[PDB]
Amino acid sequence: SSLYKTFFKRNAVFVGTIFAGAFVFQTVFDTAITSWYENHNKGKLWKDVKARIAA
Amino acid sequence: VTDQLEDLREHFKNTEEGKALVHHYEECAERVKIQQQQPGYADLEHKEDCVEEFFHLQHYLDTATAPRLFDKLK
Amino acid sequence: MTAAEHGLHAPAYAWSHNGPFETFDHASIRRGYQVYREVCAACHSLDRVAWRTLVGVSHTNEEVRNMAEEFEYDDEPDEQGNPKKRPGKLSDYIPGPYPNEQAARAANQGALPPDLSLIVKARHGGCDYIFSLLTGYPDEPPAGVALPPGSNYNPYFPGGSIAMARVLFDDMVEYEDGTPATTSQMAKDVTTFLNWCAEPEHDERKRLGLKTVIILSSLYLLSIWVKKFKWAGIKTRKFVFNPPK
Amino acid sequence: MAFRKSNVYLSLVNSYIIDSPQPSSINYWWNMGSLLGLCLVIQIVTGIFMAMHYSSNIELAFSSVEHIMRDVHNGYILRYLHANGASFFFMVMFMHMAKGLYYGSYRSPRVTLWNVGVIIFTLTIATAFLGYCCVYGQMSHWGATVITNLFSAIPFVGNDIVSWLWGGFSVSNPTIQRFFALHYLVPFIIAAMVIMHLMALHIHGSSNPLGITGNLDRIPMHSYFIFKDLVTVFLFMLILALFVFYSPNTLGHPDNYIPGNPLVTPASIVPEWYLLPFYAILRSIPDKLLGVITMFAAILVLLVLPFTDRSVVRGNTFKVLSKFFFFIFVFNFVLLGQIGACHVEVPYVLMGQIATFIYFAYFLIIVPVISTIENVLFYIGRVNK
Amino acid sequence: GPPSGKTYMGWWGHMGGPKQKGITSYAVSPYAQKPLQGIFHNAVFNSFRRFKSQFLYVLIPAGIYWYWWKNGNEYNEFLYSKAGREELERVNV
Numbered sequence: 001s002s003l004y005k006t007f008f009k010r011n012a013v014f015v016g017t018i019f020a021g022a023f024v025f026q027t028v029f030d031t032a033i034t035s036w037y038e039n040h041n042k043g044k045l046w047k048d049v050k051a052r053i054a055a
Numbered sequence: 056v057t058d059q060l061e062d063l064r065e066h067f068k069n070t071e072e073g074k075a076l077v078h079h080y081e082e083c084a085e086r087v088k089i090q091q092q093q094p095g096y097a098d099l100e101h102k103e104d105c106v107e108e109f110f111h112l113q114h115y116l117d118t119a120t121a122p123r124l125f126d127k128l129k
Numbered sequence: 130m131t132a133a134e135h136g137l138h139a140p141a142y143a144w145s146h147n148g149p150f151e152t153f154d155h156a157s158i159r160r161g162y163q164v165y166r167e168v169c170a171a172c173h174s175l176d177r178v179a180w181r182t183l184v185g186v187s188h189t190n191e192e193v194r195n196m197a198e199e200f201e202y203d204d205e206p207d208e209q210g211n212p213k214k215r216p217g218k219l220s221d222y223i224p225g226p227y228p229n230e231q232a233a234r235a236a237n238q239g240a241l242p243p244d245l246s247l248i249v250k251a252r253h254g255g256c257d258y259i260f261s262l263l264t265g266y267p268d269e270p271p272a273g274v275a276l277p278p279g280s281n282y283n284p285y286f287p288g289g290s291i292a293m294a295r296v297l298f299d300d301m302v303e304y305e306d307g308t309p310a311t312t313s314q315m316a317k318d319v320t321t322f323l324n325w326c327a328e329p330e331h332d333e334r335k336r337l338g339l340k341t342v343i344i345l346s347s348l349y350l351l352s353i354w355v356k357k358f359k360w361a362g363i364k365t366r367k368f369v370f371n372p373p374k
Numbered sequence: 375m376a377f378r379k380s381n382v383y384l385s386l387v388n389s390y391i392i393d394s395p396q397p398s399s400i401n402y403w404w405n406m407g408s409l410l411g412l413c414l415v416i417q418i419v420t421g422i423f424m425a426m427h428y429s430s431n432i433e434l435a436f437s438s439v440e441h442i443m444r445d446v447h448n449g450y451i452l453r454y455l456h457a458n459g460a461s462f463f464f465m466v467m468f469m470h471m472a473k474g475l476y477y478g479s480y481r482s483p484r485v486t487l488w489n490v491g492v493i494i495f496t497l498t499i500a501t502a503f504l505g506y507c508c509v510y511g512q513m514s515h516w517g518a519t520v521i522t523n524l525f526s527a528i529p530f531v532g533n534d535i536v537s538w539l540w541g542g543f544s545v546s547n548p549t550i551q552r553f554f555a556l557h558y559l560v561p562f563i564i565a566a567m568v569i570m571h572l573m574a575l576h577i578h579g580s581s582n583p584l585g586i587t588g589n590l591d592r593i594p595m596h597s598y599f600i601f602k603d604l605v606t607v608f609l610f611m612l613i614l615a616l617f618v619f620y621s622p623n624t625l626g627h628p629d630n631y632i633p634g635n636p637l638v639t640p641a642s643i644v645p646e647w648y649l650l651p652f653y654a655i656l657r658s659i660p661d662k663l664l665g666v667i668t669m670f671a672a673i674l675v676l677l678v679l680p681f682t683d684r685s686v687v688r689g690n691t692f693k694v695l696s697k698f699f700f701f702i703f704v705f706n707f708v709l710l711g712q713i714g715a716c717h718v719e720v721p722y723v724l725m726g727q728i729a730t731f732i733y734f735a736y737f738l739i740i741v742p743v744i745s746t747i748e749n750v751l752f753y754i755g756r757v758n759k
Numbered sequence: 760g761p762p763s764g765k766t767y768m769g770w771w772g773h774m775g776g777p778k779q780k781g782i783t784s785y786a787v788s789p790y791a792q793k794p795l796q797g798i799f800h801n802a803v804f805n806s807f808r809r810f811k812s813q814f815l816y817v818l819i820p821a822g823i824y825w826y827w828w829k830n831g832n833e834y835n836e837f838l839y840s841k842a843g844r845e846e847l848e849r850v851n852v
């Protein structure tokens with residue numbers, strides 16, 4: 001896979017880059033999961049129930 | 056409106072299987088009251104009940120009503 | 130052991146919260162609270178549930194504040210030391226109907242209505258059991274069953290003789306959202322509400338599980354690959370023997 | 375020489391985890407030990423963080439745990455990890471022990487290794503019991519009552535030992551407070567025993583599936599087994615995660631979600647699953663004293679195996695009769711557990727009594743008889759005179 | 760340091776095995792090997808072999824115990840039903 005040799009060129013990924021990528025992942029991954037989860041449960045959430053309420 | 060569970064139960068008590076089960080429960084109930092009106096029922100220590108026959112009925116009804124009841128509820 | 134002594138096995142209803150990806154249905158929780166307030170609360174405490182936990186779950190911050198204020202709680206003594214009451218706040222716990230155990234037994238033929246905060250987790254069958262119990266009172270006990278005075282028959286309760294009579298009847302509650310208040314509907318709602326009381330972390334717990342399981346699965350598949358790579362030289366290693374002269 | 379070898383602290387790490395010569399052929403069954411160390415760590419870490427929010431007073435214990443469940447951020451995760459982790463700790467320990475049984479790991483020169491392991495097992499059972507009592511649910515109270523009463527079977531002073539353990543007339547405040555203090559202590563004694571266990575392991579090294587010497591072909595712990603351990607560590611975490619997040623109460627008892635009541639013992643009382651086979655053994659003896667003696671003997675009999683295994687080869691890999699009876703033993707153990715979960719009723723009582731016999735007969739009769747027969751079979755099948 | 764007791768395992772260079780002579784080993788860098796994907800077509804039918812020789816040692820004892828369990832269970836069910844209350848009084852006490 002030449003896609004690897006463009007970014008890291010035959011060398012292993014260094015801890016600094018690993019740590020940095022981890023912070024990014026944490027945020028991205030969380031939003032992706034929360035989104036899917038809330039969508040999959042559309043109609044049941046409190047957000048949805050509050051929309052059909054007015055007091 | 057009318058209770059959704061009672062509806063599905065009544066409906067199932069009237070299928071072939073349901074009738075057969077209420078029959079057996081009924082045949083048990085009959086046999087029981089006949090034993091109560093006889094002398095010495097208080098001191099018998101061998102009184103028969105129809106829980107078993109009742110449970111078979113209820114079990115059948117549960118098995119048929121349980122997977123459908125919620126599609127009718129909100 | 131006899132079927133009567135064990136109790137009838139509760140069947141599996143299709144709860145909307147069953148399933149790894151499913152949250153509670155919050156409208157049902159909202160309704161369940163009403164059924165609890167208007168029917169159950171007369172005999173059942175709910176000691177472990179604080180008003181504040183309702184906010185953002187089934188009611189608004191405003192609605193809960195109004196509900197809490199309808200109850201008086203002991204306050205700190207005044208400047209002179211005499212006791213004084215106070216309306217409820219969000220930090221308070223939902224009050225119970227009786228002041229002590231003895232007063233609760235007196236109002237129920239000597240029986241003690243358990244607290245319902247954990248009832249869903251404190252019984253085999255969970256929601257299926259609670260629901261079935263509430264909707265399982267026959268108009269008449271099976272033939273031959275000698276039911277003690279003050280007792281009631283219910284096939285789902287162990288031994289069949291339960292001290293709580295049927296309390297749910299069609300349209301005894303007027304749902305704020307217009308839903309037809311049938312007995313099975315009300316049972317379905319309180320039960321959903323009681324599951325939340327016992328497992329308030331439910332929705333969030335499953336969301337975290339989803340992330341945890343995805344990361345761990347990947348790490349597992351990945352480690353297998355890394356291990357095979359690190360072992361390739363050993364696994365394919367070859368030996369030859371040439372006996373010494 | 376390399377620093378990892380010259381430094382006083384690092385050399386310990388090097389000799390035990392980096393350069394430690396391992397037999398090239400050990401299989402995944404040899405990954406259980408690291409999984410046990412990991413379990414020990416999970417129990418200690420989660421318990422200390424929970425201790426920070428726990429009250430041992432009998433009036434507050436149950437509510438303090440509900441407080442951890444409801445008010446402590448991520449509290450339910452800590453409690454569910456701790457509870458489910460205790461169960462996972464036993465599943466893995468049984469596998470670690472079963473592995474030992476099958477491969478003749480208890481044999482010379484690893485007898486000391488095996489004996490220390492038996493002590494750890496007893497300590498682990500005691501630690502989990504102490505923790506279970508801390509919740510102070512219905513199962514906690516009666517479990518504490520029944521188990522402290524085991525000592526009343528001791529002639530003369532038994533009831534005195536019990537009142538001393540209780541700190542009073544019955545399981546009360548003094549009891550739960552001392553059980554929490556002891557629950558906190560034992561895990562550290564287990565940690566010290568694990569070190570003694572690893573020390574005995576280090577002098578002779580691990581055994582292997584062939585049952586023969588590993589001296590002709592060793593490979594370093596570092597890299598090979600460090601990464602091979604990683605594979606099972608993740609699989610272990612994945613499964614533990616499925617329970618913690620998706621089915622946190624499946625391995626427990628619903629009665630422990632009811633505060634303990636000194637005047638009522640639930641008809642539904644059942645011991646924790648990992649204690650069922652032992653419970654069944656005790657229940658099978660219709661005598662108080664003998665019931666408790668036989669149950670304890672079911673654990674101590676593990677010490678007899680190095681002497682009753684008469685074979686001249688280590689392990690069951692190339693032994694047809696021994697493999698068969700080993701599995702009779704395993705499934706008989708599962709049966710004992712299924713009997714423990716049942717009512718003291720007709721078919722069950724007799725089945726439990728027979729399974730109990732089979733349990734002891736395995737160590738005292740089957741193994742010595744069968745291993746002797748296999749010895750002879752191996753001989754006459756090749757000697758032509 | 761203090762004298763150490765003789766064991767059955769040494770360390771690199773003095774493992775305690777017998778003197779080896781005549782055996783020659785060969786190996787190839789994992790780097791030079793075909794990346795993990797070849798464990799199929801060649802390593803699939805070959806697999807499942809270390810359980811075709813063992814399943815009987817596991818299955819037979821399992822079968823014996825499952826049957827024994829099923830039997831006692833079904834017998835208990837009969838004893839506590841109406842049909843068996845007569846036999847129950849007999850086998851009980």
Ligand code: HEC
Pocket residue numbers: 164165168169170171172173237240241242243248252259262263286290291292293294296297319
């Ligand atoms: C007082 C008149 C009651 C009302 C109103 C409701 N309950 Fe009740 N409940 C009551 C008693 C006296 C008992 C004791 C039963 C016994 O035999 O000991 C109970 C018990 C329960 C239980 C526990 C059953 C069990 O498995 O042990 C449950 C799950 C329960 N009650 C639920 C419940 C709900 C949800 C109610 C409103 C819909 C309700 N109860 C009303 C007395 C009374």
Ligand code: HEC
Pocket residue numbers: 413414417418420421422424425428439453456457460463498501502503504505506507508509557558561626
């Ligand atoms: C204080 C440190 C601490 C240590 C060290 C610790 N625990 Fe606990 N443990 C607790 C506390 C606090 C509780 C009560 C909270 C709870 O119920 O989980 C508890 C409860 C338990 C329970 C009851 C679980 C339940 O159902 O709630 C078990 C079983 C248990 N521990 C097992 C262990 C084992 C096994 C170890 C050691 C290998 C261990 N514990 C080490 C503090 C500790």
Ligand code: HEC
Pocket residue numbers: 403404405406407408410411414467470471474477478479480484487488490491492494495568571575579580581582
């Ligand atoms: C009653 C038996 C027994 C118990 C319990 C026991 N061990 Fe062991 N352990 C052994 C034996 C025997 C071996 C040697 C196995 C071999 O090499 O064949 C061993 C080996 C090990 C190994 C090496 C790797 C392996 O899995 O073989 C480690 C690490 C280890 N044990 C850790 C632990 C820890 C940690 C605990 C408990 C908290 C524990 N053991 C409990 C018997 C036991």
Ligand SMILES: COc1c(O)c(C)c(C/C=C(\C)CC/C=C(\C)CC/C=C(/C)CC/C=C(\C)CC/C=C(\C)CCC=C(C)C)c(O)c1OC
Pocket residue numbers: 390391394396404405407408411412414415418419422565568569572575576579580599603
């Ligand atoms: C010859 O064969 C071997 C072999 O020898 C070895 C070593 C291994 C590898 C396995 C191990 C070394 C397992 C070892 C495990 C232990 C020694 C466990 C020790 C346990 C502990 C619990 C340590 C104590 C920890 C604490 C006190 C920390 C917790 C407290 C904290 C973080 C404080 C928190 C507070 C605040 C305020 C932040 C093998 O796998 C193996 O076979 C292949």
Ligand SMILES: C/C=C(C)/C=C/C=C/[C@H](OC)[C@@H](C)[C@@H](OC)[C@@H](C)CCc1oc2c(O)c(OC)cc(OC)c2c(=O)c1C
Pocket residue numbers: 496499500503513514516517520521522539556643644645646649652653656669670673
């Ligand atoms: C201060 C420290 C003390 C006092 C330590 C004591 C340690 C004792 C033993 O460990 C070494 C002991 C736990 C161990 O016996 C070998 C177990 C197999 C005991 C198994 C056991 O469990 C039960 C249980 O869990 C219950 O729960 C609801 C209820 C029980 O009856 C109904 C039992 C029971 O009848 C038995 C035998």
